[PDB]
Subunit: 301 residues, 6 copies
């Protein structure tokens, strides 16, 4: 039976093989990405029974997504190729670090997602349903879907996990704020970064007061992070490693924290776990390439 | 002074390094393409003073187009990066030959092109203005632009060359038909393929009766081609070479025929020339990679 | 429900990117191979519901096999990683064509395969069970397994297909002969090459008299091939294409013929089909890379 | 109108894709380089109207230089291919850092450069004329040219900028010294490194006393640098970044400082700017690959 | 005349081009390795007359080993291809550093090595005979060979150098211990790492008391190392460099220390030398790629 | 004992990975070349004991030559790195076939070669001494050396083989002519191409009358070739294979013919042999890459 279920829009990442401006490259590497996706994979790699829900176009890129998911062991009960196209994007990491991103996903088969996108009973018996603030920002359908989705998970005694992920590209801090204030009630687990808190509540302080979910984790760059449960605030291990491709650590981290919880581990181990994931993906090129496999933890144990 | 002026939407081609389904590749080569573009380059490579008109987004891909054009020696007097994005596409050539294409260009800065896109006086003194049936199919703006453009060329005693290039993706054979019937009057030189004639007039025969422009050249796959001028019909050299990447020979050919004319060469040499170009580009990976340089003809002479 | 079930030892192919002696290369491409495997994939790619049975080590190479199979859509109900290692091999194609192969598979987790390796009921309702003469040559366990396996398929009204594939490396023509004579009784469909018939019966003639299975297909290099059913002998289309990497066409072919039969097609179409597969894989680098997908036939139709 | 004009000998760099001895590599990357060139590009990339003066052979490598310059937007009014060959060089960066260089430029079309190499009126209205101590070291022609050149710039109210760049390969510290003492009078802006000062004046102290130009900037490795204007000595930001390919930062830096001045920015910003450039190029493979573009500063602003 | 002679089993390393799990790679680089081999090369590169003794299969990989050795200048008087196969192995370096290795060498032509494997007179006049604790761990033949070998070197006034190199894969700490206690008497020079001392004597302290050879060097990670001669304990330069591929530094180091001794240099220089080697190889991909050449020291001098 | 001895200047070839103008490439492959060198290797690969004589600079490229030669099994008794640099060149193969070459070898350590370059006794007992018309064209030293060299071979009963190889780049048809007329007397075996005969004697007919050496072989493109011995004229097998990189077949061929003779084979087999070599190298990228190994002939036998 599935332990975790996530949902979102899959995207294909195109990335240069080395730092520098995209304008100058002539060879791009192809990777499969998408927050929720990055997360499903990570979990899948750790032995967690997880299912992904989403759509992709009936194009070669869609096929690729599917193969990849299927290969990783993700449950695609409610995932399929549909008329339309698959969203993709181009990335570029500058020498001194200033990255920039370009999207080509508006109107993709995957950005459809509307309430009822799958059969709710799917959620039954499941531990968690994870989502990203990116999905609801795509379209009003999605927005609705999202609300609908956790509503249903709640209704089924399924824990709702949410990684804020504010994309200025998709919407305003006000809209984002509006969304959250409407959504928070149904959230049990929330993932957030400092910038995001600052950028939407002025200070990482107010944000906490406002968004007081049962459990909230705050990513704080390389300064570890803090977990907030039972009025308690455990701090996580900070990491002195340099980013290779920090483009998916955020998701890896969450996944990591998720796996811990799914295994009913003390907040300390969950964090520990989460950085471990984040670290690994950050240390590798690709959205979720670098995500470790269960047997790795085992040896590392 | 410019001898030739072409206009269209530039696109960035992404192509696998070897036959096979895109879904399986993980490394894509980056090339600059776009019918009119492919043509401007070819000519440029041959010593022809040519100018390109069009727009691209203010993105790294746009920058790339520009560098490439600039490097080739194309006149960019009326070419520039503008707000928006640059259109791109992914290609894939199957083992047995069934290729398939995926676009990501709708709404691109380059698909804007509306009448007056540049200063008409530019056209002055110019020998030819070349266009592709792809441009007017992009948007009504373009459609209008096209008409406008040759109108202006005509008005300036500039020869109008047109490569049909019917894209089913952009529109219907009816619309295409409608366009042509309205445009033909102002065409002096027309490039056409058998399938296109068949696909829009039932037979390569009727098409000829209907579209009787001063000079018409019919591409007939590897069976050479025929030139129609002065009620005469010269046949061109057929070529027994195998295609590597036939994705731009059509343009190369045209360019080739154009260079010939610009040099006031007998229809025989123009054809000869045209196949030569087509052959070379077809024998090379990339949209217009393979286009020979003037000094090459010289040695080949 | 599964239409086809195959079983064998998966192997990882390491191959230079271009002709020449392995001793000189410094970059090897990694491919997944193994007769039965190559076949399962081909079918899988064609829409056929097929399942693979076998084992691989608990190593990164094993993981790779699995991902690949899983991605292709193969049923792995009775496939898994087990203690031990994964067999692999290095290939090398010489300029003038003299290839040579090096194995590193003896004692691999995959070469275990003993009778009962999976639950026989799996076979139920299945059309065919395919095997290669390579498997029984690996070990006495395998040898036994093989016999056991078709015994069970027979017992379930499942058609037994066998591709001889004599490997001198594994055993002698006598042993091979011994095996066949003991196995033929249970074979409904047999795939064979001229050299193999010559090499084990003196002449491609005697081999036929001796190994008279309900249906036998003889691969005859580029001279087409012959099908023997109902005392009839249809000849297949010969192919004038040059081999790129002929290392798996043999399997592709079989798969091709299998798909045809599974679809209940006239022997003529099955052959036609088979060469088509063989040709495509032969025209591509990699063991089964080049295997076409169902939708390809469709366009080709 | 041109804001900056530089002149020198263009060279083609050949570099291994990774650290190690050249003797062991078998694949070399091709880059366009040459102090003055590296600088023209950098500026060009920043929006500065700059022109380059120099010669290259009538070879494929020359053509390459030209394409590259042309693509970057450099004014080639007085740049052209001429009989002869194009200078090139091979580089190699060792694991522990000990690099070594090999030249193949003696007698190149580009090392000709003699007084009058271009029309002086070109210089008119221009802000600065930049040169490197490498040029005059090439040949007595060049040496003369150099003197001639700034003489002419002076004569036109054009600021003379000079990056010492002592190459032991080309000449002795005495000759270098001799040159400078003869040239300094006409220099308004001088770029220098500590080693060079030490290596030619014993101490970075004496060098300053001796070479007291209106404005002098001293590169001091990663310890920032110092600017000397109006008896004042501003210090620049030191940078804690590791060199990827420090082979052109020196030029990038200068360019950077130049752009600042051209924009009439306070010495502080000029430095800031200069390190920024240097840093970026140093963080990238290639002579001037890594040089940022104007719109980058903008975002970085 | 040979100054140094080493002996062991050559192996072919297969390594991914970048960090990550082997299961995910699809391109592996081919390198020649094997402790003793890595060492012979290093020395060879430094101008030291050294000879290698060992066997490899009559396969393409064997040929490769030979070419490589031959190219490096190693004396192969008693080295040859013999029936059988060549051992090889696959490596994989994880993002966070946890490497893992996979062997395919059991039963290789090279693991034969039995007493008398070569003519003892070879050893005559030689300075040192170097060995690794890996060889005797391969097989009882080898084990015997080893003992035999230094016995013979001793008998010829040849210094015996031994790099412990405990491989848990080959045997137990007890067996290893047993071996050493039996071998130490004939050792003049011993190389050891902290872990190994800890892992076989509880503490790096006891190990020293137990294994008191004339000269013993203890590798201590990046904390330099200590040399033990004449009741004295010189400490070596610690190195603040990050490992690229630390897979052969251990050997490089030893070689380095060997070259020093062969040149009769003070222990200080020998260490200095040794780290230098280790550092260089560690800073490069490949088993012994990165090993510097004599003329490099010269420039570095 | 050496069977063959050749001498010349080694050069490093830099070549694009695919057809097209060098100006556009950005990645060049590194190969070791040089007529005589190409030949020594070929022979070496065939089991022939051959020695090479020549010099290279004390640079990383020189080192490379040496490793390569050494790895191939060539006798370097009289080969060494000397002060100076190593000659190199860049190649480029155009789509339609018009290749062009660029040298950077004038004044190289290797172009020194003067009479007495090695000890004549080396030649003793040797079957043949092979040379190319390229060497004497390099410098008057070389020119003298050449004469000197065969003089010495003659004096030692060593057969003199010469491959004309007229390089217009090095000298005039007159000088070439002058050289030959002075050298022919001492030639026993001469290799020549039609163009060369035409280009230096008007007709392939006169050339034969003029240059009547004991044995002369005329390369005639793909139309086989003719051997002239004992007033007889055997014709060789023509080859219907397409050139990949025809840049060294000429040498391969010669080598091939040489091996035959060294093995005392009938002129028919020598030719047969020669085309075989030429074909193989022509079918491969690189100067002599593609040269087959003895064991290959064996299988091919």
């Amino acid at each position: 039976m599935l332990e975790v279920v996530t949902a979102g829009e899959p995207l294909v990442a195109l990335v240069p093989q080395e730092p520098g401006h995209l304008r100058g490259k002539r060879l791009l590497e192809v990777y499969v990405g998408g927050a929720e996706v990055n997360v499903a994979v990570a979990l899948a790699r750790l032995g967690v029974k997880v299912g992904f829900v989403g759509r992709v176009g009936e194009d070669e890129l869609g096929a690729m997504v599917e193969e990849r998911l299927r290969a990783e062991g993700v449950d695609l009960t409610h995932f399929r190729r549909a008329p339309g196209f698959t969203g993709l994007y181009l990335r570029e990491y500058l020498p001194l670090g200033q990255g920039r991103v370009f999207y080509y996903r508006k109107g993709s088969a995957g950005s459809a997602l509307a309430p009822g996108a799958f059969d709710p009973d799917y959620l039954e018996g499941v531990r968690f349903l994870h989502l990203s603030g990116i999905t609801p920002a795509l379209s009003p359908e999605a927005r609705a879907f999202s609300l609908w989705a956790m509503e249903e998970a709640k209704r089924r005694g399924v824990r709702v996990s949410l990684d804020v992920n504010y994309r200025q590209t998709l919407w305003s801090p006000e809209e984002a704020r509006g969304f959250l204030e409407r959504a928070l009630p149904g959230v049990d687990l929330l993932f957030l970064s400092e910038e995001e808190a600052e950028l939407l509540f002025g200070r990482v302080e107010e944000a906490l007061r406002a968004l007081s979910a049962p459990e909230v984790v705050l990513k704080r760059g390389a300064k570890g992070a803090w977990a907030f449960v039972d009025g308690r605030r455990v701090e996580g291990s900070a990491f002195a490693v340099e980013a290779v491709d920090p483009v998916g650590a955020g998701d890896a981290f969450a996944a990591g924290y998720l796996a811990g919880a799914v295994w009913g581990l003390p907040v300390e181990e969950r964090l520990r776990l989460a950085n471990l994931l984040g670290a690994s993906v950050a240390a590798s090129r690709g959205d979720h390439e670098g995500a470790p496999y269960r047997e790795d933890l085992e040896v590392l144990l």
